Amino acid sequence: LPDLKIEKLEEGVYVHTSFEEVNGWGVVSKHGLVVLVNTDAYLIDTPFTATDTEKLVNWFVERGYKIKGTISSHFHSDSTGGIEWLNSQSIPTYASELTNELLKKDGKVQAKNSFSGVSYWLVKNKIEVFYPGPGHTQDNVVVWLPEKKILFGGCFVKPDGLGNLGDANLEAWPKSAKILMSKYVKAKLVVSSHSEIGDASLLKRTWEQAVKGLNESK
């Protein structure tokens, strides 16, 4: 099983990539980010496991950084698997109240901090959490970095195919995807969960795949 990967994307922005093996899929990988605000560090999604989340934390803590908060883009374990351990560490965890509501239903540990609004600033003018509408899941949120013009779209951004439809809203995804496009028309980079990095075109490609996957389902 490949090691938790950490790669500097640019100043103050790192992509963490963790790995899971699941029968009927082989070895799956998952991208999140760590975002620095000066010497404050923020986790955008957690690794699948407590153990990899710890490694991720330690890596930055040992380099001097203070883990100030974590935000999970949706309720599925590939974003939320580390929440429990981080809670036991008194490292502050966030999720929208819908994500938290869905985590509870799933029998999962909830984030300690939440918010009810479409938009929420985790750091004043530096980290914005935004809910486009239902897509991959009812609750999926994106994370925007205004200074850098980087959008982490989580599993909502699916330019090459929609992936797991298990909890999806095919009816709503096209609308949500358009809302996303209209909000962040000047994105320079778009980091997704299971696709390589790209520019703002990825948001259009998602709208397109949403519209396709929808038609297919009828």
Active site residue 105: no
Quote the least distance from Cβ 37 to Zn ion, whole Å. 26
DSSP per-residue string spanning 1-30: -PPPEEEEEETTEEEEEEEEEETTTEEEEE
Active site residue 158: yes
Burial letters for 21-36: b for 16+ Cβ neighbours within 10 Å, e otherwise? Answer: eeeeeeeeebbbbbbb
CB 4 within 8 A of CB 56: yes
Using the minimum distance from each CB to Zn ion, give the nearer residue, 37 or 180: 180
Which pair of structure tokens corresponds to residue 33? 């980010």
Residues that bind Zn ion (CB under 5 A): 76, 78, 155, 193
Using the minimum distance from each CB to Zn ion, give the nearer residue, 16 or 76: 76
**Catalytic choice (126, 136, 139, 178):** 136
Active site residue 16: no
- Has 194 been labeled as part of a binding site? yes
Report the relative pairing of strands 93-94 and 66-71 from DSSP bridges: parallel
Active site residue 78: yes
Quote the least distance from Cβ 103 to Zn ion, whole Å. 12
- Has 31 been labeled as part of a binding site? no
Which pair of structure tokens corresponds to residue 208? 């397109």
Active site residue 155: yes
- The annotated binding site for Zn(2+) is made up of 74, 76, 78, 136, 155, 194
Positions annotated as catalytic residues are 74, 76, 78, 136, 155, 158, 164, 194
Task: List the binding residues.
Answer: 74, 76, 78, 136, 155, 194
